[PDB]
Symmetry: C4
Subunit: 349 residues, 4 copies
């Protein structure tokens, strides 16, 4: 009985040790955030347009100007190897077979260059800045190995207070190593940035630092973790090619608004691509966001449930159900072409 | 203990095999739709008018200009034979004894001409278009056998994702055959529309196609499955004599609005009869809709519970309770004549 | 543990046979009405006024111009004898000891003249009109025996559909007889109004009939069962000295609004005393209504729980707790004199 | 597993006898008040500001013009000795080690002068007026022993109806004595204010009485128990240096609004420090209040859970978690300096 994402979550819960499952499903503090991420979608309902010819439908769409099979992406999630062996490759291959980009996390278990060597799909790289110089190295690595777009996630200045992990004394499984930080120096002055091997990131990274990153990277640049049209607009003003509204899937700040709450506003104010993630499980959630103007939706836990439960095949499976889910929804609301979606198909509840 | 519709649902659940019961009660995906269909009625409460003489009450009303015993109809539901032997006849006979129309489904187990031959009540025919030519045949059949009004349901361009059926591997019971598609050709060119024996309808049927249907049928024409005043108005502009606001009882699109949400607007904009279904269980739900301007309410599952539980007699029983329910409500709110209902008797909550 | 009304309900449920308890606690259809009657009070919260001298408090108040100990009344409830022997007397005596009026029901187990003979408190009479002439007899009886005010309840044109009673085949207990209809004629022409010994009232009683009643009764006249400022205002225009907003404690129309929803409006429009009942259990509910302008609150089930659980003493007990409850609330919100209550002490939620 | 306040409540429930636990956790009547106190915080969510340098954060803040480690205080709670031996000292010492004030209750188990003798932190004194002359004595005592600020709580004109205590026949534990009322007179005329040894306070204390208190005390004066901007403003007009919006943690009036409902208004109207308590458990609740303009938040039950569960160490523990909680929240919303908080970081839900 694997007919939707929730079915995959259930199977994933059965196969993962409790501690790993909690680490994946868990959110910050009371988890009112993850709940809100799901509940916010009920604020909109569909007003389908009847008697529209939907015999020929299209989910094809440009994201940052580049055509892909559907406006979905497998977003950046770290420690995927803890969910399934070579999790990073499995995810990237499923995304490639589906015709959509895959975003590699700075905390991946497979290195930037190894994935590129083993997968020919559209690869994006998600950057966490712990040490500027180290960040510069990874960015150039990604550039030199053909990663098409850079994603700066800015919502982990400090670690989220996830109590499930605290109660389980969650210790990052043995085998899992942060590959991208592998083999890095040890001079005695020419430097002790080695001190920067902590569990905390550079809490000082700011707008000026973004300019630095902007000059460093030549291709499409996105800023992830935004929760206001004002921040999204500033990002564009500073050179970003688009943004990813997100609350990190409820794992950072339990009382953060859902990105869906500032989606329409960010789209109207920035005039640039506004991607989004956090809370997406049903094709309907996805269509609601696209209808409000989102360029694309990034999947977090949805595809991880497929990975955890059945590896690569599970990811392929989750993506085909979601694709068929989206397609079916378009037919039902009378919007044959996904690029024609508009607020017109929605009713605020 | 058979005092209301819910009591009949309970008895029906006891008598039907689980798989058939799930197929009947089930909705699309999370079933937030069927729930919403029920919950929306709580958005209105009654403000009765006291000291009104209600010693003589009338539920009589014209629907599409034709008087009937009460503004209710037994709506189109397919595979009624799966709920009770000769389900279609049982329903039609109960409706006839009650003085209200019965709508035969394109997917009925009794043929268009057989029902007409065995029942003298007001018979309506509900059309699903799978193959144009086949549709034309059924429409002419219905015309020639005395069906008074034609109903085009437009909300099944594609099949609803009903997970209860998927989990039960629901296979349309053996005996049940789609009678109306019986004995149809097999030429080798003069044609393979035989290819059109799938579980999918003509997803291309559009406004132009509606005109075609409009010229084909000479009597009253209604378009069912609408969820916007704009669509309802276009239907009238294209020749329809009225519409049936509906979300197919929550079985097609889980996040569709309830038709009750666009009822008042459709009535004010079209100026033509606006019938409605989806979620009706209590006489109060019915009176609320009539008060908002609905010409009539079509029963879906309510009368099917009566059928499933006690056959024809069960349907008669559900209709007498509902009639007495409506009558009692009119007395209580001080509107002796059902045709005098207005938004004045309601309080938006 | 008898510290509030709910505690008395619990004890009453333990002492009454289930069928009698259901008949008392029950509401119409789904009982969404009784629930709403309780829930509506949460729409207001208190904004107390601090540093006000509340060392000397007063609950004394005029109702229809006549001073009483507190703005409470034990309202009309029929078949009180089914809850406790000589229930009507017990209630009337507790009310008298408390300094508030008691309203005798047309369906009481003790006759109009017997109660007056055995209780010297302020007695009101509640009239149900089944047969005009019979009604005239009771009204004159009440007049001649010293009942101070007449109450016409208008919300039982037809009986409420209470499903608990239907499931229990509730048969009015053996002993209980409708005393006020005792010993009445049997001519053969001079008449068969004997036909009017049914379970249904005069559904034709209207505004003209109210004028008739108005000319018949010389003292204070109140119309009970109103749910709109418009009806309340018409009642005043037709001669009523005040009204009682009420939905009969949720036992008549499950979807009726709570009288609390039209309280402020009725007070502002009529300019006459507006009493109210339906849903009152906590002193806070009572103070909220008084603050919104209600002249007084009638208790229905609250005092019946005291009666059912411990007879007269139980009623005395419920009234002293409620009085102390009200008094304590006045101190806490800083309104020492109950007649100084105003919307100023409330916050709409 | 002691990672947040709720964890300490759980441990406290395990260690305290039920009767003492109920006396601590309990609220007035239905306890809809305490629930509302918690629920109201969900009316706001965070809109963090990204790309802000939060590598250096500050929780330091002035309260009534005096710098302290963070805008928190351990508020006045009586009978602390019933929760842990020498509870008052334990609380005061934990607060002092944390760098924040401690407020001694008039009903403390340790005397005004004994605490001052044993603790050198910032000590505030909370005054309940039962007898004017007795009140004057305590106020002068506090003045002479170095207490920095006086707090008049005005929301106990009468005792709250807490039903948990009534059901448990809660009798103030044996050992616990009201130290501050110790050794006081017994003349025969020069007086029987001895009559004022009841469980009730001076219900007459009013605005004029506040002036009296104002002239008596030379330092900072705060009025606690306010629930309206109008009352808060009057307090300032009468000489108070600030106020403490509060509903006494839901223990006095079950339907009282939460102070959070008049926080912004009180801040805008008075132009003076507006402190607040009632319902605070998560750092997020605290940051929301500060963002709305509160000068500081007083902890009631939160720190008592630490006391009850692990004495002084438990209090130290609750304060370090709360401090780290607040600090983490500031980083996450991008407001490095706690004094820079504004409504800008919130989204009304
Ligand atoms: C186990 C797990 C690991 C994650 N790792 C990262 C990461 O390394 N970098 C990043 O930018 N986001 C990371 N995220 C956040 C995701 O990019 C995404 O914002 C989020 O999961 C979306 O919400 P959803 O899980 O409801 O889809 C992670 C999320 C989860 C659940
Ligand atoms: C078992 C079942 C079969 C149905 N079959 C049909 C059909 O063949 N044609 C059609 O137009 N609607 C069909 N409907 C939808 C109904 O016409 C009606 O819109 C719906 O049931 C109304 O909602 P309700 O079930 O809450 O009353 C069906 C509904 C159910 C529950
Ligand atoms: C058992 C029972 C009997 C009643 N009998 C009468 C009656 O004879 N006449 C009348 O006017 N109202 C009658 N009422 C309605 C009450 O006057 C009153 O409106 C109602 O109970 C108020 O609501 P509450 O029960 O929540 O207080 C009755 C209510 C109950 C629960
Ligand atoms: C057990 C207990 C004792 C209290 N004693 C006092 C007191 O003596 N004086 C006072 O002003 N407030 C007193 N309070 C109220 C507190 O000062 C504070 O307003 C309240 O607890 C804040 O709510 P919270 O408990 O949700 O934090 C008490 C509260 C509790 C729970």
């Amino acid at each position: 009985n694997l007919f939707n994402v929730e079915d995959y979550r259930k199977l994933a819960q059965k196969r993962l040790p409790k501690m790993v499952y909690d680490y994946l499903e868990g959110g910050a503090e009371d988890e009112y955030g993850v709940k809100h991420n799901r509940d916010v979608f009920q604020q909109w309902r569909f007003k389908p347009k009847r008697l529209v010819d939907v015999s020929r439908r299209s989910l094809q769409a440009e994201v940052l100007g580049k055509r892909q099979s559907m406006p979905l992406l497998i977003g950046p999630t770290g420690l995927n190897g803890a969910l399934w062996p070579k999790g990073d490759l499995a995810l990237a291959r499923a995304a490639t077979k589906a015709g959509i980009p895959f975003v590699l996390s700075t905390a991946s278990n497979m290195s930037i260059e190894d994935l590129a060597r083993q997968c020919d799909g559209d690869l994006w790289f998600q950057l966490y800045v712990i040490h500027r110089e180290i960040a510069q190295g990874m960015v150039l690595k990604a550039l030199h190995t053909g990663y098409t777009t850079l994603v700066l996630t800015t919502d982990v200045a400090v670690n989220g207070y996830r109590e499930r992990d605290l109660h389980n004394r969650f210790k990052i499984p043995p085998f899992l190593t942060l590959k991208n930080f592998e083999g890095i120096d040890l001079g005695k002055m020419d430097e002790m940035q080695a001190a920067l091997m902590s569990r905390q990131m550079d809490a000082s990274f700011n707008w000026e630092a973004l300019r630095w990153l902007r000059d460093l990277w030549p291709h499409k640049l996105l800023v992830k973790g935004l929760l206001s049209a004002e921040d999204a607009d500033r990002c564009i003003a500073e050179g970003a090619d688009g943004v990813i509204l997100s609350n990190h899937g409820g794992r950072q700040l339990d009382c953060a608004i859902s990105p869906m709450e500032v989606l329409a506003q960010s789209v109207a104010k920035t005039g640039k691509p506004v991607l989004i993630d956090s809370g997406f499980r049903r094709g309907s959630d996805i269509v609601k966001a696209l209808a409000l103007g989102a360029e694309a939706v990034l999947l977090g836990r949805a595809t991880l449930y497929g990975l955890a439960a059945r590896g690569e095949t599970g990811v392929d499976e989750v993506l085909t159900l979601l694709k068929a889910d989206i397609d079916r929804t378009l037919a039902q609301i009378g919007c044959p072409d996904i690029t024609s979606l508009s607020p017109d198909y929605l009713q605020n509840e």
